[PDB]
Enzyme design. Structure first.
Site, short mmCIF file in Angstrom:
data_model
loop_
_atom_site.label_atom_id
_atom_site.label_comp_id
_atom_site.label_asym_id
_atom_site.label_seq_id
_atom_site.Cartn_x
_atom_site.Cartn_y
_atom_site.Cartn_z
N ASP A 35 0.78 -1.25 0.05
CA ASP A 35 0.03 -0.02 0.11
C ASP A 35 0.71 1.04 0.04
O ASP A 35 1.18 1.76 1.07
CB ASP A 35 -1.00 0.08 1.28
CG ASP A 35 -2.14 1.28 1.22
OD1 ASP A 35 -1.76 1.95 0.35
OD2 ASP A 35 -2.62 1.27 2.24
N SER A 199 -0.28 15.47 -11.97
CA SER A 199 -0.59 15.24 -13.23
C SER A 199 -0.81 16.73 -14.26
O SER A 199 -1.38 17.44 -13.58
CB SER A 199 -2.01 14.34 -13.53
OG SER A 199 -2.25 14.26 -14.81
#
Length: 330
Positions: A35, A199
Site C-alpha cells: 500500500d 498530473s
C-alpha cells in the site's frame, strides 16, 4: 541488494493485489497488500480477536525465534474506506522477494474491522508511503522500504501491476525490460506523507488533451481512480446511459457498454488507461448496472491515482534524497 516478488489480484475485478512476505524464523509466509498510501506493516496474528479472523493466515510471534516485543508500543489506523485495525508491535525479520530487513516493526492486530475479516485473501498490509505517516506510538516506526533503502543497489522500488493478471514489485533496481519507451519522472511533495504529484491533464477516448494540473497521490492500496468532479463528469458523459447514483455510491453504467479509454498526463508524456480497465462489473450479482472505475474525489479531499491508473503503467517510486515518481507505458 535487491528484491523481486510477484503480486497477484485477489479476485476477477483486480479489487486489490497480494504479495507473499516472509516474517520470522522459521519463515511464516503471509500474503500482504502492498500500500503506497499508508505506512504501517500490520498482520493478522495469534493475538487477533478470534471472531474477527475468517480464513486469513496469521503471524504467531511466539513461534519466531527472532521476534521481540516492542515494549509499550501500540498502533491504530483508519483508512479512507472506513476500515480500521489496531494492536501491539513486535520487531522481527521480514523478507520480500529475497530482500531481508532485520528489526522490522511488525504490527500485530488485536482488532480488525469487518471488511478485513470478510476478505479472506488479505493477511495484512505492507505500507510504502513515507514513514512520517506510521501510526506506532509512542515511538514511530519505519517502513520496510525505509529500513531497506541504504542496503539497496538504488534507493527505489517499482510497481508493475497487471490487468486481470499477476505483476511485480521490485526493490533496488529498475527492470528495463518491463516497460516500453522511456520513463518520465515528475516531482513529489512529501508534505502529507504520500507519493503526491501533479498530473498535467487528461483526455477521454480519442478526444483532445486538456492541459490542467491535477494534484493527487500514487496509491497502490486504492482500487479505483478518484479525480475532480469536472473530469469525471466529462468521462462518463461519453458513455450512453451512465449516471451518478447516490444509492449505489458513484457512477454506474450499462453493462452492455463499451467504455472509452482515459489518458492522464505525466509531464509531456501520456499514460493511456484502456476502457476495459474502467469496468468493475455488476453492482450486485446478476445486475445489468455496472460500477465505474473512475469516480469523483469530491468527498475525499485528495485525488487518488489508484490501481485503475497505476496498472496501466510501470511506476518508479524513487526514494532518493529528493523523492520523485516515474511513469512509463508498458
Amino acid at each position: 541488494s535487491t528484491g523481486s516478488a510477484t503480486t497477484t489480484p485477489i479476485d476477477s475485478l483486480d479489487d486489490a493485489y497480494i504479495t507473499p512476505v516472509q516474517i520470522g524464523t522459521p519463515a511464516q509466509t503471509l500474503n500482504l497488500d502492498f500500500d503506497t498510501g499508508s505506512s504501517d506493516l500490520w498482520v493478522f496474528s495469534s493475538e487477533t480477536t478470534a471472531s474477527e479472523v475468517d480464513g486469513q493466515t496469521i503471524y504467531t510471534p511466539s513461534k519466531s525465534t527472532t521476534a521481540k516485543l516492542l515494549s509499550g508500543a501500540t498502533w491504530s489506523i483508519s483508512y479512507g474506506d472506513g476500515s480500521s485495525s489496531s494492536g501491539d508491535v513486535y520487531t522481527d525479520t521480514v523478507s520480500v522477494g529475497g530482500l531481508t530487513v532485520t528489526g522490522q516493526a511488525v504490527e500485530s492486530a488485536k482488532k480488525v474491522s469487518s471488511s478485513f475479516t470478510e476478505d479472506s485473501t488479505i493477511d495484512g498490509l505492507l505500507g510504502l508511503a513515507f514513514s512520517t505517516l506510521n501510526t506506532v506510538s509512542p515511538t514511530q516506526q519505519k517502513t520496510f522500504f525505509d529500513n531497506a533503502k541504504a542496503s539497496l543497489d538504488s534507493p527505489v522500488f517499482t510497481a508493475d501491476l497487471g490487468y486481470h493478471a499477476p505483476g511485480t514489485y521490485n526493490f533496488g533496481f529498475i527492470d528495463t525490460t518491463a516497460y516500453t519507451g522511456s520513463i518520465t519522472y515528475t516531482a513529489v511533495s512529501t508534505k502529507q506523507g504520500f507519493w503526491e504529484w501533479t498530473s498535467t491533464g487528461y483526455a477521454v477516448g480519442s478526444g483532445t488533451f486538456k492541459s490542467t494540473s491535477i494534484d493527487g497521490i500514487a496509491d497502490t492500496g486504492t482500487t479505483l481512480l478518484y479525480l475532480p468532479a469536472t473530469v469525471v463528469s466529462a468521462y462518463w458523459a461519453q458513455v450512453s446511459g451512465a449516471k451518478s447514483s447516490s444509492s449505489v455510491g458513484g457512477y454506474v453504467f450499462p453493462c452492455s457498454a463499451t467504455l472509452p479509454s482515459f489518458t492522464f498526463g505525466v509531464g509531456s508524456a501520456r499514460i493511456v488507461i484502456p476502457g476495459d480497465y474502467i469496468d468493475f462489473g455488476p453492482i450486485s450479482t446478476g445486475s445489468s448496472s455496472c460500477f465505474g472505475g473512475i469516480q469523483s474525489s469530491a468527498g475525499i479531499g485528495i485525488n487518488i491515482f489508484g490501481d485503475v491508473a497505476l496498472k496501466a503503467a510501470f511506476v518508479v517510486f524513487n526514494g532518493a534524497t529528493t523523492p520523485t515518481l516515474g511513469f512509463a507505458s508498458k
